[PDB]
Amino acid sequence: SDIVIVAGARTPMGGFQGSLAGVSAVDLGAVAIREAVQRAGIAAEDVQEVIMGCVLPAGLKQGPARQAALAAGLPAATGCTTINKLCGSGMKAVMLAHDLLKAGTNQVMVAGGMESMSNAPYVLEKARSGLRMGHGEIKDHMFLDGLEDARTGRLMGSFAQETADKYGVTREEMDAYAIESLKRAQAAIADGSLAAEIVPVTVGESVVKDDEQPLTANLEKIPSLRPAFRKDGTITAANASSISDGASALVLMTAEEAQRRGLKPLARIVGHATQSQDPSEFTLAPIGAMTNLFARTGWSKDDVDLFEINEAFAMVTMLAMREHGLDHAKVNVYGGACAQGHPVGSTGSRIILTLINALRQKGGKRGVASLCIGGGEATAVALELL
Amino acid sequence: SDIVIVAGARTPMGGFQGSLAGVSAVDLGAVAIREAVQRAGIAAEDVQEVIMGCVLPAGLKQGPARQAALAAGLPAATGCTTINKLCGSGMKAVMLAHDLLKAGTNQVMVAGGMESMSNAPYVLEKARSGLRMGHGEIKDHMFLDGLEDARTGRLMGSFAQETADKYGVTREEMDAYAIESLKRAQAAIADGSLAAEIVPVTVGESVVKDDEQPLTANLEKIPSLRPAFRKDGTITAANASSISDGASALVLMTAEEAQRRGLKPLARIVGHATQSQDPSEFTLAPIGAMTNLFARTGWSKDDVDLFEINEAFAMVTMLAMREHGLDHAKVNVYGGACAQGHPVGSTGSRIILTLINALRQKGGKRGVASLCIGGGEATAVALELL
Amino acid sequence: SDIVIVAGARTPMGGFQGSLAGVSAVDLGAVAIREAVQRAGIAAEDVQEVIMGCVLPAGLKQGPARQAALAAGLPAATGCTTINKLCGSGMKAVMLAHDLLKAGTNQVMVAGGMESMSNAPYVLEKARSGLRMGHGEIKDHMFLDGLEDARTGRLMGSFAQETADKYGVTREEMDAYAIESLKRAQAAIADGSLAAEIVPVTVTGESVVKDDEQPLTANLEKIPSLRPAFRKDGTITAANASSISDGASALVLMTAEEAQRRGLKPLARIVGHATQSQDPSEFTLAPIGAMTNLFARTGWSKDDVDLFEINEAFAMVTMLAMREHGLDHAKVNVYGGACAQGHPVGSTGSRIILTLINALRQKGGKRGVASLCIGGGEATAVALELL
Amino acid sequence: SDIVIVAGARTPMGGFQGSLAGVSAVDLGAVAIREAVQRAGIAAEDVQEVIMGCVLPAGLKQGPARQAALAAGLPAATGCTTINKLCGSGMKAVMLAHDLLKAGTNQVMVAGGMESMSNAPYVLEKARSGLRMGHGEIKDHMFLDGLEDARTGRLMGSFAQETADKYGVTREEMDAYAIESLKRAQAAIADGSLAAEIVPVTVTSRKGESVVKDDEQPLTANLEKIPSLRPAFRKDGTITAANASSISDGASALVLMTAEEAQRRGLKPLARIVGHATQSQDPSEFTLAPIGAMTNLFARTGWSKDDVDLFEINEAFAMVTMLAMREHGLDHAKVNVYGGACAQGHPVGSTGSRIILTLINALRQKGGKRGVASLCIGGGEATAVALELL
């Protein structure tokens, strides 16, 4: 009945057209799954069902999760499903695995997420039936089906900008938050802290073992960047998370199944929760996400040692902290997406590994991971070390 | 907790650039979702969670399932996920919602699927980074992301031709299955047999109420047509399912939740199962699926009054009927995808609705629905009318 | 020194995705080059150089005039060039051929043009270096490289609209001109007057296209009620403007000495040619200048001219040229023009030369002037007489 | 009428997506023309007709030559034609300009060519009517309309490789001529011999505005790597990136007049054109066309190789120049004396007029009076020009 996380791994996150541009989302997935299975102390053959999140599947070919599982060396006998809950896909994958394990459908599962934003193709909406006469449109798949509101075509960024104005969040405040996340991401790379959640990728040949974007960023240029989403706005490239490539994966089991294998798992899942509201409000949903999780769990803000609230935009984390009265001391201790980027499919499960690793290395037992989700939603997971 | 299908609705199936060509996957999902909710005798605000099948999301804009729920008239408060288990997607959405109800995450869910194969756009792969020099491909998204093996580039039909040669299934055998399926579909259209599962679609403004492909098909010429996947092969455009457009949604609840609302559910989900094996062998996966399903539930084929076994190819239903010793008179009794079409996102849930309709009208009680899946898989669901 | 047209052929003019859409511009040029040379009574090998106009060469493959020449049965020893003087490309082709023969470069040449506006591809401008991120555009080759002004991005019809207003031309005048062109073009097809200039084109079942498509599918009743085409309260329409069109044209040219050396009788002598170049916004007027410059160099006057071919890019082009030069509509485009037939951009310039010659032979004149306007602000004119 | 070259200029040659990638073919055209009309000591207005060679006009907008002239600053009264005779376009523009001048059509013309191979777009053949079902193609305009045989679809390098094989030409021989072409091209750059023929081009980068004054490829070529380069056109071939000219960006323009019109203006022209010739044969034998073209020119002019002080025989491949030199019995010390296309590159639309400018300049500086300029042409052709300094 108690659902435990046995092991996991994430690739480095790559800059846009950066260090993982040579690697398909499927191959990044395969590497995370392979490593998570190996760390979990089980053979490939034991994995009953795979669920992998992926927001941008055009050009990935038939069954991104299925391709990822086989190239991870999981046998044909492992059934696979790819899921899209946008930004939250990765967490939603861990939340479906969780419910399937409590439903008694399976005993060992892989859940996680993958994105190569660098390899999203373009689409021709009128190629098939004919353009006929006159100039036409080639659509960016990542903007069209990923980053843009469907009803109004506006980038999630320009929604984030109306909310930051509404809450009196400042240019300097969001830059201060984004600088601090950068410093923490740099410190964490430098002292070897992230090694324990990372699996290197090899791409003539070359090993990417460290998050690219925080080792390339210039903290000095940050107060002078142009507003990214609205003329004379306050949100920039640096105080919003960057387009990125990465994959993440966990092995979940029932506790009985861990113990039956003689495995000591990392963490039990205490609960999960979902908040859904107007798309315009997506950056605020984690507040809702987390108040639902507190009510379901029994937990309050006092019970939690560490939080991972994803930095989709600096303002998302800051307003969640403010509305829930949290200290930046307890929140994204190793930095986050502003410094490292946001591979939308993967971040949802990635922040769940990061939370564990930091609970383990900083000496906590209880954590909450949470992120906002295009279309106006947010997921949250409550977690205890064992 | 017992898990029940309270109500369900399916659009007509349209042919490739046919009757529903003017309607997006999202809008087909919305017609179906709104009508299921209506038929369940609840309000839109009552649906806590939505999961919808969708194999080809290119061009549909952000969160297909999310756009469908909201255009259905479901509030922003209902949370939404899009899933992809290829031709299995709609059955997998119903399986996930089943397991989430058993886990106690929700009490009311909509699950189903939605495909506009007509409106699948074209994909340009290396445009983003630059083609640099030399010619390139522009990929049919439907082919690349839907119908072709990933590792080989081979259409699933090419795998089905192989398997059928290997099992000694002949052209006249496959065509005999195909002519019978057609007469069942035509009869069922003329009968008014399928008025209870269908919700019409408005595209002047003409209402589409009937499956068009069964009506347009030339029963006469089935044995004349050229082979599809090999110049001397036995599989044709008519003993394989056609490209089509459609959607389908069910309302699922706990037994207790339908009882509290004083609703009369249609059916109980007795259980589900998945089978996964080599991609080249996907056509045979339903045999293994139906074996896992009898094991999981203690059912036998003698327990089953009616089967709905998806006719992705005639040879898939003929081989599953050969290996399980089934009567054709009890399989796909209002026809199937050889006559009607296969909108790959929707068919998995569609056949669950069609199985319940025929059990009610033909007066059985116990039903099995199963279908094959790109990547070497099949899913299976056992239900019982209440 | 004296320069003669020995013979020629033009394909029918097909509509946009109409009768010749299954045929490439290279293959339409091949049909017209082949028949011109059969009608001249010379061997493929007696052709020393080819010059073919083609405004929309993208997707046509290496050397459009080279391909059409070879497909037409001409040997590899015949040198080929492709030219683009926009709408004038096909007249200019004849013009360069005339000068090369004058200069002693060759004794026997083929000159004309070809266009498949139906087969014009789409172009993607940044796909080589990278779109990087964001929505981009896919550009209609026919519009980007043919029909739009490069400096403004404005359709030629948008220039034509402003000029027609400035010169006091009305909806009713242009529609009336364009109904007359329709009636002439239908007459000439039905009574067989165009047979002798046309080479039929067999398509792929297999069938023979022998008649210009567009005058036969035109709705005369709708003309007066059509929406303005290039400005929301304009007078110009799809009907009194020329339509996108497919086809090709080809003439054999020689010095007079070579004609009599081989003992041929040529159709016509070329008395001279002229070019008028001015502001692209004034391109509909440039023919007025072109004919003026021609009258100055030949020593002809309007009154020496028995028949005129003045291409109907727009009905106001021919109207304004007719008004300024004081020409009798009865002596101008006697078998109709491009308002009814279409304007295959690269072919038209040489086509009206062949039509002018057929018209003089059957209506019983001697002296003709072909002129057309050119995108970018130009115009060419040719002086002909029958022998 | 005698026909004189009064003046001309050619842009530096940019490598594929290199030094001139941000300039359109037309902007390179404008720059060459404007500098040629200035050096010719005439006014923009005195130019009555423009003929510009351009092999890849997709995406350049309506009337490439017309835009080149208007942007250079020639008035709207100056008539303009774009021409395509593939690799020979530039030279064809000048031959046509020579003929129209001889025929009395004009007294003052501009001829040349312009190519931006960097900025050639892609084309979708079936997008108009629609792909309907199944995977289609997106074609490289440079390849489809410039560099491959229509009939066979084969790259011009494929034919080149097959002719080299047919004649027994060795990797070593081909590399030895390319090593010499690059030495010549480096030495020409460094002691400023190319300065007189070149008009610099102004470019932009994230650095700001800079000036491109030099041919980039001779400067960034690795001389020592050349024997070690992989073959370019068949698994176990002899032709490579170094012994075949490179894809390139560039424009060139000449002012032509009748000798009378130049006299009338008090100008002193650079050279008279003594004649031109063309050779056409099977597209597979394009690399051999220059041999016939020169034989035909010799026949039309009454000249022999003994009358000729310097030659430019464009190095589309090392083997083009090498086979012409062997068959015409030519001295390599008198052929491509400032290097050629193997070192510098090959903007297909400009190279025909460019080499005529290089040949005049070599003749004034290295000495001599009489030159021949000849190059091969995709589709199996070749043009040649004989000219005399005045």
PDB file of C-alpha atoms in Angstrom, chain A residues 70-203:
ATOM      1  CA  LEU A  70      13.702  -0.601 -25.483  1.00  0.00           C
ATOM      2  CA  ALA A  71      16.901   1.495 -25.981  1.00  0.00           C
ATOM      3  CA  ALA A  72      17.232   1.580 -22.113  1.00  0.00           C
ATOM      4  CA  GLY A  73      17.382  -2.238 -22.592  1.00  0.00           C
ATOM      5  CA  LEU A  74      13.879  -2.951 -21.134  1.00  0.00           C
ATOM      6  CA  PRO A  75      12.379  -6.020 -22.898  1.00  0.00           C
ATOM      7  CA  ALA A  76       9.410  -5.924 -25.323  1.00  0.00           C
ATOM      8  CA  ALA A  77       7.398  -7.481 -22.369  1.00  0.00           C
ATOM      9  CA  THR A  78       7.501  -4.053 -20.542  1.00  0.00           C
ATOM     10  CA  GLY A  79       4.352  -2.131 -21.565  1.00  0.00           C
ATOM     11  CA  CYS A  80       4.928   1.624 -22.232  1.00  0.00           C
ATOM     12  CA  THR A  81       2.734   4.821 -22.322  1.00  0.00           C
ATOM     13  CA  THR A  82       3.870   8.421 -23.258  1.00  0.00           C
ATOM     14  CA  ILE A  83       1.909  11.224 -21.446  1.00  0.00           C
ATOM     15  CA  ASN A  84       1.519  15.017 -21.910  1.00  0.00           C
ATOM     16  CA  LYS A  85       0.323  17.238 -18.983  1.00  0.00           C
ATOM     17  CA  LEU A  86       2.685  19.983 -20.314  1.00  0.00           C
ATOM     18  CA  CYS A  87       5.256  21.306 -17.740  1.00  0.00           C
ATOM     19  CA  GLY A  88       3.879  18.740 -15.170  1.00  0.00           C
ATOM     20  CA  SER A  89       4.155  15.610 -17.411  1.00  0.00           C
ATOM     21  CA  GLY A  90       7.155  14.297 -15.425  1.00  0.00           C
ATOM     22  CA  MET A  91       5.354  14.521 -12.038  1.00  0.00           C
ATOM     23  CA  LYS A  92       2.022  13.282 -13.557  1.00  0.00           C
ATOM     24  CA  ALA A  93       4.087  10.199 -14.701  1.00  0.00           C
ATOM     25  CA  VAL A  94       5.193   9.543 -11.056  1.00  0.00           C
ATOM     26  CA  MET A  95       1.532  10.211  -9.912  1.00  0.00           C
ATOM     27  CA  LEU A  96       0.045   7.661 -12.426  1.00  0.00           C
ATOM     28  CA  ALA A  97       2.748   5.074 -11.517  1.00  0.00           C
ATOM     29  CA  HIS A  98       1.767   5.745  -7.817  1.00  0.00           C
ATOM     30  CA  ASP A  99      -2.028   5.174  -8.429  1.00  0.00           C
ATOM     31  CA  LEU A 100      -1.341   2.049 -10.593  1.00  0.00           C
ATOM     32  CA  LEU A 101       0.802   0.581  -7.740  1.00  0.00           C
ATOM     33  CA  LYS A 102      -1.970   1.380  -5.127  1.00  0.00           C
ATOM     34  CA  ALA A 103      -4.598  -0.067  -7.575  1.00  0.00           C
ATOM     35  CA  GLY A 104      -2.484  -3.297  -7.602  1.00  0.00           C
ATOM     36  CA  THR A 105      -2.087  -3.177 -11.436  1.00  0.00           C
ATOM     37  CA  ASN A 106       1.782  -3.745 -11.093  1.00  0.00           C
ATOM     38  CA  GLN A 107       4.570  -3.969  -8.364  1.00  0.00           C
ATOM     39  CA  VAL A 108       7.609  -2.411 -10.217  1.00  0.00           C
ATOM     40  CA  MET A 109       7.235   0.652 -12.589  1.00  0.00           C
ATOM     41  CA  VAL A 110       9.447   3.323 -14.277  1.00  0.00           C
ATOM     42  CA  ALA A 111       7.901   6.863 -14.290  1.00  0.00           C
ATOM     43  CA  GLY A 112       9.540  10.060 -15.614  1.00  0.00           C
ATOM     44  CA  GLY A 113       9.859  12.399 -18.531  1.00  0.00           C
ATOM     45  CA  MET A 114      12.013  13.511 -21.425  1.00  0.00           C
ATOM     46  CA  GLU A 115      12.334  16.561 -23.667  1.00  0.00           C
ATOM     47  CA  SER A 116      14.650  17.701 -26.457  1.00  0.00           C
ATOM     48  CA  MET A 117      13.394  21.274 -27.103  1.00  0.00           C
ATOM     49  CA  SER A 118      16.466  21.634 -29.435  1.00  0.00           C
ATOM     50  CA  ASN A 119      15.066  18.889 -31.800  1.00  0.00           C
ATOM     51  CA  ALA A 120      11.381  19.981 -32.005  1.00  0.00           C
ATOM     52  CA  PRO A 121      10.698  20.223 -35.739  1.00  0.00           C
ATOM     53  CA  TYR A 122       8.555  22.801 -37.649  1.00  0.00           C
ATOM     54  CA  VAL A 123       5.039  21.857 -38.959  1.00  0.00           C
ATOM     55  CA  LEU A 124       3.212  22.866 -42.215  1.00  0.00           C
ATOM     56  CA  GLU A 125      -0.518  23.006 -41.431  1.00  0.00           C
ATOM     57  CA  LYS A 126      -1.580  23.330 -45.168  1.00  0.00           C
ATOM     58  CA  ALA A 127       1.090  21.075 -46.887  1.00  0.00           C
ATOM     59  CA  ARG A 128      -1.310  18.011 -47.098  1.00  0.00           C
ATOM     60  CA  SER A 129      -4.383  19.668 -48.681  1.00  0.00           C
ATOM     61  CA  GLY A 130      -2.402  22.404 -50.613  1.00  0.00           C
ATOM     62  CA  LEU A 131      -1.321  26.068 -50.046  1.00  0.00           C
ATOM     63  CA  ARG A 132      -2.862  26.770 -53.512  1.00  0.00           C
ATOM     64  CA  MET A 133      -1.874  30.469 -54.014  1.00  0.00           C
ATOM     65  CA  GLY A 134      -0.107  33.090 -51.895  1.00  0.00           C
ATOM     66  CA  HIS A 135       2.338  32.930 -48.938  1.00  0.00           C
ATOM     67  CA  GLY A 136       1.749  30.574 -45.975  1.00  0.00           C
ATOM     68  CA  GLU A 137       2.837  29.587 -42.454  1.00  0.00           C
ATOM     69  CA  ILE A 138       5.534  27.282 -41.012  1.00  0.00           C
ATOM     70  CA  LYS A 139       4.764  26.815 -37.283  1.00  0.00           C
ATOM     71  CA  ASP A 140       7.327  26.213 -34.485  1.00  0.00           C
ATOM     72  CA  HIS A 141       6.030  22.941 -32.843  1.00  0.00           C
ATOM     73  CA  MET A 142       7.515  23.954 -29.448  1.00  0.00           C
ATOM     74  CA  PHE A 143       5.640  27.343 -29.413  1.00  0.00           C
ATOM     75  CA  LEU A 144       2.399  26.001 -31.124  1.00  0.00           C
ATOM     76  CA  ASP A 145       1.826  22.798 -29.060  1.00  0.00           C
ATOM     77  CA  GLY A 146       4.149  23.544 -26.057  1.00  0.00           C
ATOM     78  CA  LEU A 147       4.663  27.184 -24.916  1.00  0.00           C
ATOM     79  CA  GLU A 148       1.577  29.111 -26.324  1.00  0.00           C
ATOM     80  CA  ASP A 149      -1.982  29.317 -24.917  1.00  0.00           C
ATOM     81  CA  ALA A 150      -4.245  27.623 -27.543  1.00  0.00           C
ATOM     82  CA  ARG A 151      -7.291  30.005 -27.262  1.00  0.00           C
ATOM     83  CA  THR A 152      -5.268  33.326 -27.435  1.00  0.00           C
ATOM     84  CA  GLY A 153      -1.858  32.194 -28.976  1.00  0.00           C
ATOM     85  CA  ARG A 154       0.010  34.166 -26.149  1.00  0.00           C
ATOM     86  CA  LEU A 155       3.336  32.754 -24.769  1.00  0.00           C
ATOM     87  CA  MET A 156       3.015  31.505 -21.140  1.00  0.00           C
ATOM     88  CA  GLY A 157       5.611  34.263 -20.513  1.00  0.00           C
ATOM     89  CA  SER A 158       3.089  37.095 -21.310  1.00  0.00           C
ATOM     90  CA  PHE A 159       0.647  35.503 -18.788  1.00  0.00           C
ATOM     91  CA  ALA A 160       3.494  35.333 -16.184  1.00  0.00           C
ATOM     92  CA  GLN A 161       4.085  39.103 -16.866  1.00  0.00           C
ATOM     93  CA  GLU A 162       0.434  40.133 -16.118  1.00  0.00           C
ATOM     94  CA  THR A 163       0.521  38.130 -12.791  1.00  0.00           C
ATOM     95  CA  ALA A 164       3.927  39.679 -11.732  1.00  0.00           C
ATOM     96  CA  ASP A 165       2.491  43.236 -12.303  1.00  0.00           C
ATOM     97  CA  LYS A 166      -0.744  42.229 -10.413  1.00  0.00           C
ATOM     98  CA  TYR A 167       1.369  41.135  -7.331  1.00  0.00           C
ATOM     99  CA  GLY A 168       3.764  44.140  -7.398  1.00  0.00           C
ATOM    100  CA  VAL A 169       6.731  41.785  -8.186  1.00  0.00           C
ATOM    101  CA  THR A 170       9.694  43.923  -9.407  1.00  0.00           C
ATOM    102  CA  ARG A 171      12.458  43.578 -12.074  1.00  0.00           C
ATOM    103  CA  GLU A 172      15.146  43.847  -9.291  1.00  0.00           C
ATOM    104  CA  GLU A 173      13.313  41.268  -7.040  1.00  0.00           C
ATOM    105  CA  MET A 174      13.066  38.639  -9.864  1.00  0.00           C
ATOM    106  CA  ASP A 175      16.769  39.365 -10.847  1.00  0.00           C
ATOM    107  CA  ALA A 176      17.870  38.948  -7.154  1.00  0.00           C
ATOM    108  CA  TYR A 177      15.946  35.579  -6.976  1.00  0.00           C
ATOM    109  CA  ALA A 178      17.439  34.462 -10.356  1.00  0.00           C
ATOM    110  CA  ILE A 179      21.061  35.512  -9.321  1.00  0.00           C
ATOM    111  CA  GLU A 180      20.762  33.515  -6.002  1.00  0.00           C
ATOM    112  CA  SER A 181      19.399  30.379  -7.868  1.00  0.00           C
ATOM    113  CA  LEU A 182      22.387  30.763 -10.279  1.00  0.00           C
ATOM    114  CA  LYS A 183      24.926  30.982  -7.403  1.00  0.00           C
ATOM    115  CA  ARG A 184      23.389  27.870  -5.695  1.00  0.00           C
ATOM    116  CA  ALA A 185      23.390  25.928  -9.056  1.00  0.00           C
ATOM    117  CA  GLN A 186      27.124  26.881  -9.551  1.00  0.00           C
ATOM    118  CA  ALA A 187      27.971  25.900  -5.885  1.00  0.00           C
ATOM    119  CA  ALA A 188      26.100  22.551  -6.250  1.00  0.00           C
ATOM    120  CA  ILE A 189      27.924  21.691  -9.551  1.00  0.00           C
ATOM    121  CA  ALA A 190      31.351  22.747  -8.073  1.00  0.00           C
ATOM    122  CA  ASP A 191      31.141  20.760  -4.752  1.00  0.00           C
ATOM    123  CA  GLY A 192      29.949  17.541  -6.570  1.00  0.00           C
ATOM    124  CA  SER A 193      26.445  17.806  -4.893  1.00  0.00           C
ATOM    125  CA  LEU A 194      24.439  17.040  -8.146  1.00  0.00           C
ATOM    126  CA  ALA A 195      26.611  13.990  -9.166  1.00  0.00           C
ATOM    127  CA  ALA A 196      24.400  11.661  -7.035  1.00  0.00           C
ATOM    128  CA  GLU A 197      21.243  12.517  -9.091  1.00  0.00           C
ATOM    129  CA  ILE A 198      23.054  12.809 -12.480  1.00  0.00           C
ATOM    130  CA  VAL A 199      23.852  10.188 -15.146  1.00  0.00           C
ATOM    131  CA  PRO A 200      26.421  11.425 -17.683  1.00  0.00           C
ATOM    132  CA  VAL A 201      25.582  11.219 -21.440  1.00  0.00           C
ATOM    133  CA  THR A 202      28.254  10.579 -24.140  1.00  0.00           C
ATOM    134  CA  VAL A 203      27.727  12.375 -27.499  1.00  0.00           C
TER     135      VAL A 203
END
